[PDB]
């Protein structure tokens with residue numbers, strides 16, 4: 001089954017040595033898509049980019065990794081998001097990614113998967129492309145994986161975040177969130193005190209990522225833990241997106257998901273999340289099957 | 300005497316290995332300041348920068364070169380200008396465009412104040428430049444207005460002439476390129492416009508001419524200064540270099556006269572040249588040793 005990813009695809013600049021930046025493909029949605037694609041999964045990226053260097057550059061990268069770019073529009077009037085990794089400094093302000101709209105959306109088939117995060121909900125057009133998209137995919141008989149990726153910083157009014165999150169989860173089939181983002185959401189301090197924020201918000205199934213700990217599968221049969229492999233932190237940047245990638249790659253393998261499948265999925269997610277931090281770039285270390293298992297077992 | 304430089308400072312990313320860029324110090328005012336400093340002149344940079352990896356990078360460079368950064372206010376709500384040469388821009392609400400009159404230090408007599416058209420583009424800082432020029436003049440200071448044309452950066456090309464005009468009014472000395480004398484008047488031959496600024500209120504104008512040296516225009520006549528014959532590799536940062544060597548020389552006295560003027564332009568041409576023979580930009584700005592090794596070699 002195809003996994004549709006919609007959202008941001010930037011050009012992350014990672015300080016190599018204090019007088020020289022490193023150029024590596026970036027963006028939540030992008031990363032997630034390249035991840036799923038690298039694992040041989042069938043993934044299509046939906047979104048907007050500038051017909052500029054970063055744009056074509058990023059578009060090429062998508063192709064090099066096997067991601068379908070049939071629905072990736074490049075606009076020689078917009079400026080593809082560039083950023084400086086540190087914390088995240090967002091050079092390009094509006095960002096061509098925010099211009100996606102309901103029309104850039106493709107026909108969804110039954111059982112396919114739709115992905116998006118808080119990021120894509122930030123600005124005008126894109127926000128409607130995400131919610132309209134989610135709704136359509138559900139009507140088509142597909143699934144939606146909403147990953148609350150909280151980058152509040154780049155939001156105009158932090159007043160909207162809860163509402164979008166809320167109706168976002170209503171639309172979701174599965175919600176992914178970090179321990180960290182939970183607290184920040186409903187003014188918590190310890191996440192457990194709010195590890196139902198999403199469930200009590202319409203999402204019957206929520207996955208909570210936890211440092212190098214692993215995750216937490218919350219379905220009605222109960223809470224389940226999956227330990228994360230012993231990592232060696234080089235650049236955390238991209239762990240979460242890698243986590244979602246390995247997660248969607250696993251679910252697309254079938255037509256209906258259950259605890260059984262969710263666990264195999266989460267196991268895969270944790271693995272990918274671990275790996276992706278062993279390099280210097282959101283997607284540099286995203287595994288290929290030949291590499292996924294050399295690690296799986298090896299841990 | 301101290302030379303105050305106010306304006307743009309941004310980082311320029313230049314390609315290299317397949318997947319990597321190189322942080323290059325850039326910006327008219329920046330270069331000019333680094334120039335005057337890297338020549339043993341006392342120079343202070345006035346302006347705004349983002350508190351990002353970039354801003355600090357630039358700020359350090361300023362310190363590495365001996366430029367006073369006491370009035371280089373760093374900020375966490377602004378975004379340091381960065382460009383990727385393939386000369387592309389990614390930061391538009393600006394950053395160094397936020398400097399205001401409240402960021403100007405106290406001026407002392409005989410001190411020099413510098414700025415260009417660039418610093419006059421966005422209205423959050425255009426006031427810092429004009430307010431600054433005015434104060435420096437009141438303090439018994441001097442003003443060097445360098446019309447640094449860049450109609451690309453301007454949204455309303457209708458403002459340009461007015462600001463320029465008001466700039467010459469405040470300035471003591473105006474620096475312009477032949478090419479610029481044409482964009483302003485239109486004349487296809489700059490010799491036609493050599494009195495452009497003079498009519499706008501500037502008693503003395505210094506016209507950059509590249510390989511052809513400079514042409515000084517003062518009330519008592521015009522005096523041509525030819526430039527040392529050289530490679531002519533990459534002409535980038537040349538003008539900013541020219542201004543630097545120019546301000547470095549004038550700051551050497553308290554009241555500039557005929558001789559200081561004559562020498563200053565000689566110095567300017569020299570610096571402008573060295574800028575050319577080499578690639579990059581600020582990576583062509585000479586040190587007090589090679590300037591001599593150079594002069595005493597042509």
Ligand SMILES: Nc1cncn1[C@@H]1O[C@H](CO)[C@@H](O)[C@H]1O
Nearest residue numbers: 008010012026027028238241282
């Ligand atoms: N594109 C973007 C905007 N704000 C953050 N991001 C992306 O988030 C990803 C990690 O989840 C990074 O690759 C970063 O570029």
Ligand SMILES: [K+]
Nearest residue numbers: 170172202203
């Ligand atoms: K739901």
Ligand SMILES: [K+]
Nearest residue numbers: 235237276281
């Ligand atoms: K990484």
Ligand SMILES: [K+]
Nearest residue numbers: 467468469500
């Ligand atoms: K004047």
Ligand SMILES: [K+]
Nearest residue numbers: 533534535574
């Ligand atoms: K040069």
